[PDB]
């Protein structure tokens, strides 16, 4: 595909969201 | 002799700008008036001389964006 | 003709940006004075007598544009 | 007659243009002014006389389009 | 006898805008000047006398339109 | 050699505000007459070559917001 | 060296303010101008390096409404 | 020294407001100058010392509203 | 004081109406030029003196309607 | 004082608008000069004191409308 890797001339070029479990991206802020 | 004329005018804007451009000079029995320019067509002549010169990068391609 | 003439008018130029264009003289009884031209109006002179002579492209065409 | 001042007009102009166009000159009680006129007028006076006369090509009517 | 002031009239024009329309003589004792006129108005009336002396058409009429 | 140059430029700035930049000295036979400059100029022109010199910031990049 | 120079271009802000601002004095055949600033330009200029140097505060972080 | 330089500048004001400011004096081969400053110009200097100083209130916090 | 200068200014005020603010009184060696002021500001300076001082009333609170 | 004050001004306009209102004299080295005053301001000059002295009405009040 082509959204997912760079986007259109940079556009999204530094966004790298960690992609982790649930808990991992909740309960470390979650209170 | 690009070099040579930039540096020229480099330094006759120096000293334009501080204070020696030599308006006029009369010694008794004589004198001579060189004409007067502004600065800012100096400083863009220079300018134009340099990027036209040899010399390093001064410019950049407009500029990029990404979030 | 037209060579010397251009590298005459850009030595003009030159000396005029910087110092050396002397607008009156005068020797105790004898003087002269000479009509002074502007520096925008010299540049456009030499820029239109420099694409009319025999020196090469300078100026190209407009830009296009691609995805 | 019309190449003379064409010539000489042409002329003029370099000669105005650089240094040369002497505005008034004096030698002690001898002393004459002549009336200055600007680049402008000067080059658009240019721009006629030698099209009226048999100077060769140098306006095209205007421009086509096609696709 | 229109035509020789319209020849002195163009005539005048040429060694004015040249270099030669003396603004003012002087002769230690014995100096005039004159009132200096612009192109503008100039080439207006030379252009007036042109048309109302004999001389045949310049300037024609409108302009038509055809498919 | 831009240190000395920025240190002539600011020299060349405060006399220049107070009464010091001298305009032209005459003296009985013998006078030079030199070019004025805008302060706004040697303020413009001491900027840019300070920030281009060895020294150190100035001035930083555009500010943002947090609530 | 700031301070000392503050308060003597302090100073010749109030000698050009009343009367002292000395443009030019002439003696038998010896004669100097200054260059002469504005007034404003000078209290921004006076107001530029008061702020850069430690004295007091002269300036708020602008100003809260409340209620 | 602001009390004196209140006095100073309230005098140099009135004198000036009169006929009184000096704009220049000539004596036989020794005149000097002084740059005319303006009157308004004046009074925000008047006005600026005279608060900042320990001079009494002169203006207080713009004005309420009841019915 | 205040009606010191007062009457001196409504007098110059007067004075300077008519025919007799002499700006430079010229005697052989000996040139004095002082500086002038408009009309205006000068009965501005006249506007501004007297109420400040406890002279009689000259301003009432703006104008009320009953119909 | 105001009636001669006044009488004063009238002559200053009359003298001043036909032919007399001396700009300045010069006795052979011996010069003054005066400085000069508008027509509108002193009319006006001449329009204040003439109501605030105790002459007649001049300017009666608004004006009614009746059918």
């Given at each position: 595909?082509?959204?997912?890797?760079?986007?259109?001339?940079?556009?999204?070029?530094?966004?790298?969201?960690?992609?982790?479990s649930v808990d991992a991206?909740?309960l470390?802020?979650?209170? | 002799?690009?070099?040579?004329?930039?540096?020229?005018?480099?330094?006759?804007?120096?000293?334009?700008?501080?204070?020696?451009?030599?308006?006029?000079?009369?010694?008794?029995?004589?004198?001579?008036?060189?004409?007067?320019?502004?600065?800012?067509?100096?400083?863009?002549?220079?300018?134009?001389?340099?990027?036209?010169?040899?010399?390093?990068?001064?410019?950049?391609?407009?500029?990029?964006?990404?979030?």
């Amino acid at each position: 595909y082509h959204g997912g890797g760079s986007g259109f001339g940079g556009q999204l070029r530094s966004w790298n969201p960690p992609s982790e479990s649930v808990d991992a991206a909740l309960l470390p802020n979650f209170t | 002799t690009r070099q040579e004329e930039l540096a020229a005018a480099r330094a006759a804007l120096h000293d334009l700008m501080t204070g020696k451009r030599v308006a006029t000079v009369q010694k008794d029995g004589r004198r001579v008036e060189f004409t007067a320019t502004s600065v800012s067509d100096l400083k863009k002549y220079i300018a134009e001389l340099e990027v036209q010169t040899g010399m390093t990068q001064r410019r950049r391609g407009p500029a990029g964006f990404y979030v």
